[PDB]
Amino acid sequence: PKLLNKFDKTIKAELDAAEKLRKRGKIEEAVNAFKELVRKYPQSPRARYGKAQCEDDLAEKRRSNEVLRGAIETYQEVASLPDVPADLLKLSLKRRSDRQQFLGHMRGSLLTLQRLVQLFPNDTSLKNDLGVGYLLIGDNDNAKKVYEEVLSVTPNDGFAKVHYGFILKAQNKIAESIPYLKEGIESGDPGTDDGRFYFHLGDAMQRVGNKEAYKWYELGHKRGHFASVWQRSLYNVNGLKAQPWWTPKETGYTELVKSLERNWKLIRDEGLAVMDKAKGLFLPEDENLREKGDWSQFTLWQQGRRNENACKGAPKTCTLLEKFPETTGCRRGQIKYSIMHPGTHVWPHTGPTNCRLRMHLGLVIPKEGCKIRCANETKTWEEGKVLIFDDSFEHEVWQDASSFRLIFIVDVWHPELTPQQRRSLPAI
């Protein structure tokens, strides 16, 4: 990579000396070394880039967002200098975007990537990076347009193929997404061996009835993406006891389970009252997990945060639950009423994390037509009784009764998680 313009080649000796200090771990001394080069040579792009890299390393040594914010600006200063070589310009702004994403400045990272695409219009990899930027902010429409441009000039780019197929599947274009996901994974290009693409390829195949779906769950498991063929969560803590169905004693949460079963009728009655007098609080399921039917949820807690307006509708239930931080503090779970009507079939799916267990309390259960499968075992609900399963295992639900079915869903931390882990895991 050509990093020295005409002037920097003349001071290459001073530049290499400072870089050796940064490479020797003496970051604080290399910071002042490159700062002195920037003072003496204010137009040197290599001296400016060296100052940015040292600020980057110092931000890690101290885990400082404020220091990294300065490095982000210094990387941009490199681009504003005259006669900057193309390799140095690309490297500074790409790293700036990467650090903007690390800080959560996703809007800023997008502008940096847009500037790179304008500067190097032929580099398709920068377009692929711009596509990821749109995906990180949820703009699947602009991401789709980007990967369509990449596939027009580079039709066999595997990175662009899997990301196009992911967007297609997200838009419920199930049958269309499969060739892009399969051929993209099979390309072996960097960035295509990702669990997210094995997950959605196998799920797309399941929804169209293709038997090849479980062959891809096998390969995903063999490559280290899934704990097993059945358990396909992607945000995991390794080593947690993996088991489809649990008993209350196994979870250790006996006091919560007894409290739910002893007081189940009051939980039912507050849910029925919301159905009758405030049905707008029940929101339709919005993750494209239904094949058909009507399925809605009324959420009291999410990501360990109490929903204040929701607890005004179920005040006694919220008061009862606030005694159990193992569920109210579960930042990777929810507490919610869940209603399902006849004619509903929920696609096989898994949750995102192995760090929770999911409890179901039966509230209004018709005598026939309702069942839930987890892994290879199908069960039914009982009014006033708790079922416990690990929803990181593939599960599927049917509702073919003659009236509605109402349950209460209570997520808890996996019992084997230490208190330190429950406080540090990013919320989902």
């Binding site: 931000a59 885990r63 400082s64 967002n65 990294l68 994403q101 690390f102 800080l103 959560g104 996703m106 990821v132 995906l135 990180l136 949820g138 992911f166 997200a170 997210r196 997950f199 959605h200 969560s233 992607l234 945000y235 399921e285 993750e287 494209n288 997990l289 999410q302 990501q303 929810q334 799916h349 898994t350 949750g351 995102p352 929803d391 990013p426 919320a427 989902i428």
Partner: peptide, 18 residues
């Protein structure tokens, strides 16, 4: 969007620096 019951989003967590 949030990953409440499945893995529908490209990423399910948020970045907040260090």
């Amino acid at each position: 969007g949030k990953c409440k019951d499945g893995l529908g989003e490209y990423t399910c967590t948020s970045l907040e620096g260090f």
